[PDB]
Symmetry: C3
Subunit: 277 residues, 3 copies
């Protein structure tokens, strides 16, 4: 399928909740917070009212990249758009289509791979909140964008993937030929290089070349730093077949210390040749 | 606003290297008016710039530029004996060119872009001391038809400082909603950074603006950069987000916590900033 | 200058992993001829390459490639048993494809680009020791019509070294004004770097050259890179700047200070270089 035109006013409830071991997460339903937080998907033109509630005992905020928001949804203590413990606030995110300005220039649309995160826990830049897990992905689609069979979010948060213990993935499953979308976000203190065995994408907005006139580099390794986000769609096993296809940071001490996961690509019969964990 | 005209003029300017307060060093176009960053040099593709350089300091200095056309005698390195002894003078010559089709059929790219100049001999034979002290400045080379901004602001991430300013001391930049604001972003020293602007976004290409609906460049509000990287872009102040004190900062978490933050102060037409002191 | 032809040929090469002087390890295409960086492999989109691999060492080694098409049995990892035991042999197969349209209407990029191969097994399950020792090399996949260079030079930022060399020992590369020179730039190890070339510049895209007036890619002379990044470009030696000893270096200041520097020696037609004494 493909993304339609946007322009709908959407509403969602979001909660900030404490998780085990001093972690913190966002969720759309009480008791269902996750790290990373829930995936938010919009079409260019949609407005999103996030009916936010802070269930925790310390102030929290919601700050987003890329989308249109007024200063009252900045989500910063500096602009008093944070949320006291037990408090509620409606954060409003807007998005727009590309189009030609009055001055004749081309205004870019909001479409892209974006993210939201806390901006007040621990420090007035959310350093503690981000460490604890207060981050999630946002995808804004342009009319006509191809929709994937599945979407997986990989966050390099310092020297962890999605705040998980070292050497515990996460792993993602697909069948050869699935259209798999990856959302890749970085957070914290470190630079990383994201690498996928057996797969490759275009270094552009969608991760696929628009066609024979697109000059973007085709890569399988990409340097990223704190708050970078990008994404792409790949065809699982395309040209390479089934297997346990590693993805990892390629900084050698990072992969050695467990910033590694598996893209488990199954044959139609469900099997993965050579996988023996 | 307006549009850059075709280039090809032979320009001259005087430049001085001078000590500034606090052990710093800076370039200036007039004696006693050195600044950090140094003066913005603007050229149209095809222009030549003769820089009549004077070192007013007691140690050797040099002038090295990125991206422009210069002969080995304008390298600005002791390795090529193109540095300037204390109290000495030298004319550095920079040339630029338009794009065009080569005889071998390939396309020769033009000089247009966001570039920079800096010292290459103070402290070490790579200018490590000079760059630390403040000897760096921006160069913009425009292509005919490029959109001209209402103002240009230079943001240099020099090690753990912005423009050699003390931690948490800006700089701040003011604009009015709707202003076409041009940002030149340069990085120097030892560390990688990620430049982020609240409430604004740009295209990751030469100009920071999409050329049109066919341009696949990623639209971003966060960009990793390392020593001697330079990029620039233009934004419409407050476009889709309104007035406010819009933070910009390095997004490496400890760097924003330890002072690499500033404010893009976007005023209403009446000159006020809602929710700002 | 010449142009790459269409691909589609089945190629075969023998590759040896061998210990080198100074506690290093390298790949070579002929026995006793290993080098750091490893030999340059050049393919046209559509070519298949069968690498008949020989491990002459006393530890397991592997061959892992970026960007190219390979089945899991040619992954080159211990995890799926595609490493090569000491004294062993294995045939790794690399395939490449041309650009085209998918049935779902989307464009499938071709394999063309600046890629690289390296060990994935020595020292750790990610080849940390093998890469550090010198088990890396470049792979160029050309698209039909790509312009061919007069020379190709590979520059690998491996931890704090260039091509595993001692600090302040280059390498240097020579050219004549007007030569079309190709640079393959690969990064490995632990650290980020920024690659800078005095006097020259390129486009931040697949080929390093703008396709024409509609290509909006940034033109640069400085680029941040991290472990396993690869890019490449072509420059006309001395174009608009003339002959000379043109430094290239990492621009992280302590890195250039510590010797991550080399010389692009661009000669005049008489063979001399202005302002440079050998
Ligand atoms: Cu912020
Ligand atoms: Cu990493
Ligand atoms: Cu790999
Ligand atoms: Cu952020
Ligand atoms: Cu230099
Ligand atoms: Cu920083
Ligand atoms: Cu932000
Ligand atoms: Cu420089
Ligand atoms: Cu790997
Ligand atoms: Cu370096
Ligand atoms: Cu330079
Ligand atoms: Cu690799
Ligand atoms: Mg691009
Ligand atoms: Mg990039």
């Amino acid at each position: 399928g493909a993304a339609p035109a946007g322009g709908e006013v959407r509403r969602v409830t979001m909660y900030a909740e404490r998780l085990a071991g001093g972690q913190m997460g966002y969720g759309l339903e009480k008791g269902k917070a996750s790290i990373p937080g829930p995936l938010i998907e919009l079409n260019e033109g949609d407005t999103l009212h996030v009916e936010f509630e802070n269930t925790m005992d310390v102030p929290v905020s919601l700050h987003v990249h890329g989308l249109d928001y007024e200063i009252s949804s900045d989500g910063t203590k500096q602009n008093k758009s944070h949320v006291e413990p037990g408090g509620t606030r409606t954060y409003t995110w807007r998005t727009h289509e590309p189009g030609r300005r009055a001055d004749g220039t081309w205004r870019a649309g909001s479409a892209g791979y974006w993210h939201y995160h806390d901006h007040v826990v621990g420090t007035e830049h959310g350093t503690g909140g981000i460490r604890n897990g207060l981050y999630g992905p946002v995808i804004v689609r342009r009319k006509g964008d191809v929709l994937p069979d599945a979407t997986h979010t990989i966050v390099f948060n310092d020297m962890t993937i999605n705040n998980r213990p070292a050497h515990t993935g996460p792993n993602f499953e697909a069948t050869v030929g699935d259209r798999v979308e990856i959302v890749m976000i970085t957070h914290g203190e470190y630079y990383h290089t994201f690498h996928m065995h057996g797969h490759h994408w275009a270094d552009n907005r969608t991760g696929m070349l628009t066609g024979p006139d697109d000059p973007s580099q085709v890569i399988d390794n990409k340097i990223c730093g704190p708050a970078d986000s990008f994404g792409f769609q790949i065809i699982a096993g395309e040209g390479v077949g089934a297997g346990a296809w590693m993805y990892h940071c390629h900084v050698q001490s990072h992969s050695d210390m467990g910033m590694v996961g598996l893209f488990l690509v199954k044959k139609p019969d469900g099997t993965i040749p050579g996988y023996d964990p």
